């Protein structure tokens, strides 16, 4: 999408795999503010918005907190306390053709600067003077949008670049966007420090003879004590015996 009409994809209720991104070698800019891409796998968020748009190379610096310019003011603006990520990579092979691709536009005039995550797709004739334009172009009456000169032979600064801004949200709602948090192998009949889906402990895991129900996950003793669990990956029930101990 164009910078003046940047698209916004909403991500919710899914496993957010950030490894494929920060380890990929196809991204020129992968900036992040107040948050590490690796730590995201350990975090959950209510919603994650990927704002996508194309801008020329030298305008890629405007996508950041405390930035000014055509893109920063009239097309796309970020807050001074942004805590997401900004990713950008060249798209000269995709967003350029012999003759000049003009399908990507940008807002050139506006009566005021944009607000954080504000989208203006209006095509009203800009009134540069005191004479109302009344939807007619002319002197002091210009079209607010203008095309980009994306050609294969253009300079890197003027060549197209695809940009995605990842913003995270935490409402009064459940966090449905979590990381994968890859597991480990399982060891039985030993004192180990185990961490299952939502619980942790220290004990000995043994093949059990109990019969959990299909929806039952972790068992309990009489004194609200965890005695058995169900392995999330393999539907095998494990008894938990406390690690051997006693007075000396």
């Amino acid at each position, epitope marked *: 999408a164009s910078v003046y009409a940047w698209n916004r994809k909403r991500i919710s209720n899914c496993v957010a795999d950030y490894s494929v991104l920060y380890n990929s070698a196809s991204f020129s800019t992968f900036k992040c503010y107040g948050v590490s891409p690796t730590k995201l796998n350990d975090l959950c968020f209510t919603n994650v918005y990927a704002d996508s748009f194309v801008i020329r190379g030298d305008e890629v610096r405007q996508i950041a907190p405390g930035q000014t310019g055509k893109i920063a003011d009239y097309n796309y603006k970020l807050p001074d306390d942004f805590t997401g990520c900004v990713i950008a990579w060249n798209s000269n092979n995709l967003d350029s053709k012999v003759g000049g691709n*003009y399908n990507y536009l940008y807002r050139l005039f506006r009566k005021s600067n944009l607000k954080p995550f504000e989208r203006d797709i209006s095509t009203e004739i800009y009134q540069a003077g005191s004479t109302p334009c009344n939807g*007619v172009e002319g002197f002091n009456c210009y*079209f607010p949008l*203008q*095309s980009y000169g994306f050609q294969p032979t253009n300079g890197v600064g003027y060549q197209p670049y695809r940009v995605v801004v990842l913003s995270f949200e935490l409402l009064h709602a459940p966090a449905t966007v979590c990381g994968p948090k890859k597991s480990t192998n399982l060891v039985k009949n030993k004192c180990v420090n185990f961490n299952f889906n939502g619980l942790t402990g220290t004990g000995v895991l043994t093949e059990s003879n109990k019969k959990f129900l299909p929806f039952q996950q972790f068992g309990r003793d009489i004194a609200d004590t965890t005695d058995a669990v169900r392995d999330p990956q393999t539907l095998e029930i494990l008894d938990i015996t406390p690690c051997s101990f006693g007075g000396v």
Partner: nanobody
């Protein structure tokens, strides 16, 4: 492929009016502006009019101001040139061109190049 097809040209007596039509097929969303040019035998092609596809704002050459009017139907993807008060000087081949370059200043379309051109239609004003 983007195809521009002109029609409506023919013989007319001076003082009459004629509406030339130019249909565009293929790409539609990328259309930024539509222009009408004309060329007489032995003379250089000259700009007649232009119209922004969105909004419909028009820009006219001084030689046709007050006589020619350029409009467009977006649903039909067509551009129309109503030539009123036909003069013998108007006898020429009229071509229509399409540009996908969106320019903030309308007057830029009076000199900037066009990437698509039709085959043109002859108009003759005898008397």
């Amino acid at each position: 492929q983007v195809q521009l097809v002109e029609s409506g040209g023919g013989l007319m007596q001076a003082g009459g009016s004629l509406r030339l039509s130019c249909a565009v097929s293929g790409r539609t969303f990328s259309t930024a502006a539509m222009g009408w040019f004309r060329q007489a035998p032995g003379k250089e092609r000259e700009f007649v009019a232009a119209i922004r596809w969105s909004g419909g704002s028009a820009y006219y050459a001084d030689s046709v101001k007050g006589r020619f009017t350029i409009s467009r139907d977006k649903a039909k993807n067509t551009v129309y040139l109503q030539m009123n008060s036909l003069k013998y000087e108007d006898t020429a081949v009229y071509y229509c061109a399409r540009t996908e370059n969106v320019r903030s200043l309308l007057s830029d379309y009076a000199t900037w190049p066009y990437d698509y051109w039709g085959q043109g239609t002859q108009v003759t004003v005898s008397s």
